[PDB]
Specification:
part of a larger assembly; 6 chains; mainly alpha; Hepatitis B viral capsid (hbcag) fold; about 50% helix; repeat (chains A, D, E); DNA binding (chains A, D, E); microtubular inwards viral transport (chains A, D, E); capsid protein (chains A, D, E); virus entry into host cell (chains A, D, E)
Chain lengths: ~150, ~150, ~150, ~150, ~150, ~150
């Protein structure tokens, strides 16, 4: 039903429609990335931030898909369509999931504020006719060291 | 990697295994319920608690699944295996999901501690010779508890 | 020599005799449980209580038995008596062990005093004409007890 | 499962692998010994020390075996293997049990500290090529009487 | 038994797996770089810091391997494997070593902290898409850094 | 390059040619020893001291060997020597790894200083001719006596 998984973070999806599919890091990369940067902090009993919390679901709910897709190729007698699903997933979904992921992840490094204040600007970048924006998009930078 | 979705709320799957994988109510029952009791409280910018947050995904991931399920039927000219998959879902994932899902909700009514304090007990009830399991299983009434 | 394993926790075997030697849950049930609830708390240098300690042996002595049981099959070319022995174990020692074992665990959830305060009662329930034993035996729910 | 029955006493089994089978007192002797030194204190309702407690299990769990072995020789029609089990026990187990026992027992006489500080040193003794250690091993001595 | 060489210097193995095997310098380079800069410091009696202390081991345990692979041609002119043994090494373990190896050396010039933050903020450079990441990958300069 | 793993502890290798190669207990005994006394003390985040730090590096480079040694028998069955690797190992190196290995542990329970003063004593108990050598040898005293 009508419920945004971001409203909770003073944010929205209606907001990330803008992200180019060509933007995100291979899922695999994101997973690796993440858990290699926080693991101890996750296999942890402290729901430190709601981001921490939230995240994890995403991961498992997904780990249920890569722990699914390997039940599909295993238990299926149709070589033509068994390969067609994986496409939907690793493509039409890797997005719905990378989209999400990266968000939290990177964000759990630059606060929220430091982030949203990113999207904001970027929103416009892409939103602007190829012939008008600089080949150099705006990037994630830990704000400067003068507070 | 080893990462339990419960450790956070002082709990484990290693636990739940107790419960008959056939105990938790059909999802239709859970959603029809929950959301018709917390909705306005969820289509909300405040995350009053982690439990709240926890759901959201669940629901969306699943409503990403049923958003999937109905698609599969549209884009798959093989009625043989096509109708199969959902057997691993409205049944093999129903578990993995009804399981969790339920859980949460409850606390959001009785209490994390009040819940953990549930399982346990029930755990006994089940693994207790048939001859001695009081036909009256254990449940979750809100405090029929006194005023005084 | 006369030495009860319970005197220590204000209790006696002379007691337990109450309980149907067939009440206590199959061990597989107990271990699968317990250890999946206290493990990290036991593979621990602190002995938070005697009850804790008490277990350890039990488990090890038994896991010294099942460590035995599976050996007997390897080193005994007499399928007749070989398969017999385990009849005196998964059955005649299951009692002596499931019996005790269970016990402990419980307290580590409700309370020594809260437990002794169990038996008793139940003791009545059983030795009470069939016509008057309320089909609902007595059990161990954690405090459904009020807040107020 | 992976759980040491000694971790509880700042000790370990991985630690007693070193004890020579030829070290311990006949089980029978240990039993006799023990209960003849503490009996009253055991048929007692006071779990004074966790050692007391612990111990007792060991004893009974064992008293269940000598109250077993005498159900084996009684209820068995195979004179060839009925004698082969007792060997495993009174040998491959009398160890697992004497090993243990002696520990507590003797220890419940020289504190723990006074004990562990024993094993420690001894560890090395045996650990040392026959041609190098003194025929005179290190023994259990109530520490001297100047505190 | 499982234990990590990093839990010590606030770090993890799984972490370095964060970096492409093709990244780290070939041993040859490193050794030269190293001892041609610290020699004095090392052939010294001062355990100036754990980094030193530790590391040193590494070398010798390894020197025993380049003092091993040579003895695999003195008494082993056998099949095709006098070749595909050194591979596995230089492909599987040489990495496990040049991995860690590098690591230390660095800190001994940049500072534990200065380092960790490297990997972190860097491993993501590459892990992050083309036109969406800075021109170059951020790297080492002494003076400015720690949180 | 020529460098010692001991100059760091006021001690040297050349200082152990002292001790008969046939002295240091089979690794198995040693390995077991350690972890049965520092299992938690090492899977630990505190580099409690240099000593600790040391070990770890040793075991792992060695754990890569006993994780190796059992791959020299899997993907190799040539002459009667996929077994001879271990007749140089447990003879010429398992020795220096038995050496070092021990070293530490000891001073980790007996004070490095209190230790050297061991070798010292020993590097004579041995260099001392047979008939004139004593019955018993010197060992690790956390203060007992006769």
């Amino acid at each position: 039903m009508d419920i945004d998984p971001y409203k909770e973070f003073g944010a929205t999806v209606e907001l990330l429609s803008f992200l180019p599919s060509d933007f995100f890091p291979s899922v695999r990369d994101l997973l690796d990335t993440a858990a290699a940067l926080y693991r101890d902090a996750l296999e942890s009993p402290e729901h430190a931030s709601p981001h921490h919390t939230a995240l994890r679901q995403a991961i498992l709910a997904w780990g249920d898909l890569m722990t699914l897709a390997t039940w599909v190729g295993t238990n299926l007698e149709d070589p033509a369509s068994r390969d067609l699903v994986v496409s939907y997933v690793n493509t039409n979904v890797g997005l719905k999931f990378r989209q999400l992921l990266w968000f939290h992840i990177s964000a759990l490094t630059f606060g929220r504020e430091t982030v949203l204040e990113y999207l904001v600007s970027f929103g416009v970048w892409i939103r602007t006719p190829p012939a008008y924006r600089p080949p150099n998009a705006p990037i994630l930078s830990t704000l400067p060291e003068t507070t």
